[PDB]
Design an enzyme around this catalytic site. Structure first.
Site, PDB file in Angstrom:
ATOM      1  N   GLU A   1      -5.840 -10.807  -1.873  1.00  0.00           N
ATOM      2  CA  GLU A   1      -6.724 -10.658  -0.712  1.00  0.00           C
ATOM      3  C   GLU A   1      -8.192 -10.622  -1.115  1.00  0.00           C
ATOM      4  OE1 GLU A   1      -5.545  -7.370   1.738  1.00  0.00           O
ATOM      5  OE2 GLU A   1      -3.358  -7.693   1.385  1.00  0.00           O
TER       6      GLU A   1
ATOM      7  N   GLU B   1       0.786  -1.233   0.000  1.00  0.00           N
ATOM      8  CA  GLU B   1       0.000   0.000   0.000  1.00  0.00           C
ATOM      9  C   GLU B   1       0.827   1.297   0.000  1.00  0.00           C
ATOM     10  OE1 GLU B   1      -2.974  -0.355   3.091  1.00  0.00           O
ATOM     11  OE2 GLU B   1      -3.657  -2.279   2.288  1.00  0.00           O
TER      12      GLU B   1
END
Ligand SMILES: [Mg+2]
Ligand code: NA
Length: 354
Positions: A259, A149
Site C-alpha cells: 500500500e 492489521e
C-alpha cells in the site's frame, strides 16, 4: 510542464526482473485516464475497498460481488496479477459476525460455556466467508491478504496482539483459522500474506516477527508479509525498511510492499498545504530523492520481494487527503505518487524509472 504518463517508460517493464508494480483501484477508475495509466504502467492491481469483508458479505448469506467482479474482470482482460484485500480485518467488517444467536454482542457474554460456543460460531462464520470468497476468486488471485492489521501499535498484551473483537472472542485462533482455511480452499500454490503497517518500527515489528515465528512453528501456512508502507519522506529510515524485510526473509517468508504512499507530511499530517497548487517544488524534489532511495533498496532486496503496489494511481485520489483534512480543519492536499492529478509525471517518476 511534464509529459503524460502514457508517453513515458512503463514501470512494470522497468521492474519486470524484480517485482510486479501494482495499484489500488476502485471500480469507477477502470476506464478513462486512470484506465490508460493502469494499462500503460502496471501489471498488478488490488481493490482499495471492494473486497473487504463488509464489501462482500454485508449481511449473512447475502454476497455483493459486482464491484469485486469488475476489478477481477479488468485484471483478466489486461493481464494483470491481483492481490486480494482482505479476508479478515477489524474495520470494514460486518457487525452481524459478532452477534450471538440471540442478537447480542458476543463481547458482552460472561458465561464461560456460552463464550466458548460464541467463539466456535464466529470461527465457523469466518470459515464460511473465506470458503465462499476463495472458491470464487482462487483462479484470479495471485496473493491473499489473509489477515490485515492483527498486530497492535502498543503492548496491551505480551504478544502485542491488537485487541479487536476478533481477539476478544477468539484470542489468536481467528488468525490460525484464516490461514488454514485459505490454504485449504485456495490450494497449496496460493500465496498467503499477513498484512500490516509500521512493520519497520519497534515494538510492532518485533511483535509481528514473533507472531509469524510462533505460527510457522505450529505449521500455520503463512507465505509472506505485506508491508503496507504508509511512510513519509524521512521516516522510517531506509535501514529500518531493509532490516524488517531481511528479518522476515530470514524466516523463509516472501515480502510484498502492499500500500505504498510517500506523504509530503509527518504525523500527524500538519501543517498541510491547502491545495495542490500551494505545494512547492521542494516537496516534490524531496519526495523524488526519497523514492529514488526506496526503489534502489527494493531492487537490492528483489530476491525477497515479489511485488510493490502503490495505494492508488495518481495524486487526484488518495486516502491521505482524508487524513490531511482531518488534522487541518477539513482542508488539505497530500501528493504521494509518481503521477500528478492530471496524469502527468512528477520528479519522483524520473528517479525510479532510471
Ligand atoms: Mg533511481
Ligand atoms: Na523479486
Amino acid at each position: 510542464v511534464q509529459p503524460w504518463a502514457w508517453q513515458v517508460a512503463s514501470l512494470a517493464d522497468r521492474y519486470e526482473e524484480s517485482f510486479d508494480i501494482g495499484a489500488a483501484v476502485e471500480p469507477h477508475q477502470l476506464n478513462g485516464r486512470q484506465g490508460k495509466v493502469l494499462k500503460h504502467h502496471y501489471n498488478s492491481i488490488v481493490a482499495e475497498n471492494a473486497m473487504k469483508p463488509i464489501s462482500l458479505q454485508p449481511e449473512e448469506g447475502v454476497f455483493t460481488w459486482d464491484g469485486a467482479d469488475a476489478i477481477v474482470e479488468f485484471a483478466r482482460k489486461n493481464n494483470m496479477n491481483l492481490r486480494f484485500h482482505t479476508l479478515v480485518w477489524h474495520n470494514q467488517v460486518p457487525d452481524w459476525f459478532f452477534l450471538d444467536e440471540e442478537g447480542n454482542p458476543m463481547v458482552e457474554e460472561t458465561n464461560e460455556a456460552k463464550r466458548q460456543a460464541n467463539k466456535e460460531l464466529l470461527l465457523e462464520r469466518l470459515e464460511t466467508h473465506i470458503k465462499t470468497v476463495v472458491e470464487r476468486y482462487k483462479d484470479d488471485v495471485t496473493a491473499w491478504d489473509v489477515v490485515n492489521e492483527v498486530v497492535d501499535d502498543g503492548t496491551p498484551n505480551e504478544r502485542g496482539l491488537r485487541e479487536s473483537v476478533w481477539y476478544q472472542i477468539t484470542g489468536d485462533e481467528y488468525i490460525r483459522v484464516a490461514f488454514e482455511t485459505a490454504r485449504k480452499y485456495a490450494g497449496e500454490d496460493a500465496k498467503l500474506f499477513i498484512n500490516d503497517y509500521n512493520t519497520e518500527v519497534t515494538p510492532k515489528r518485533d511483535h509481528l516477527y514473533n507472531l509469524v515465528q510462533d505460527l510457522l512453528a505450529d505449521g500455520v501456512p503463512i507465505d509472506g508479509v505485506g508491508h503496507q508502507a504508509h511512510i513519509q519522506i524521512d521516516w522510517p529510515t531506509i535501514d529500518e525498511i531493509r532490516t524488517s524485510m531481511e528479518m522476515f526473509a530470514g524466516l523463509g517468508l516472501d515480502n510484498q510492499v502492499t500500500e505504498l504512499d510517500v506523504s509530503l507530511y509527518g504525523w500527524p499530517p500538519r501543517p498541510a498545504f491547502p491545495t495542490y497548487d500551494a505545494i512547492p517544488q521542494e516537496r516534490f524534489q524531496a519526495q523524488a530523492d526519497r523514492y529514488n532511495q526506496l526503489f534502489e533498496l527494493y531492487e537490492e532486496l528483489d530476491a525477497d520481494l515479489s511485488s510493490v503496489t502503490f495505494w492508488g494511481i495518481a495524486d487526484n485520489h488518495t486516502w491521505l487527503d482524508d487524513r490531511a483534512r482531518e488534522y487541518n480543519d477539513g482542508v488539505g492536499k497530500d501528493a504521494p505518487f509518481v503521477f500528478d492529478p492530471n496524469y502527468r509525471v512528477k520528479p519522483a517518476f524520473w528517479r525510479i524509472i532510471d
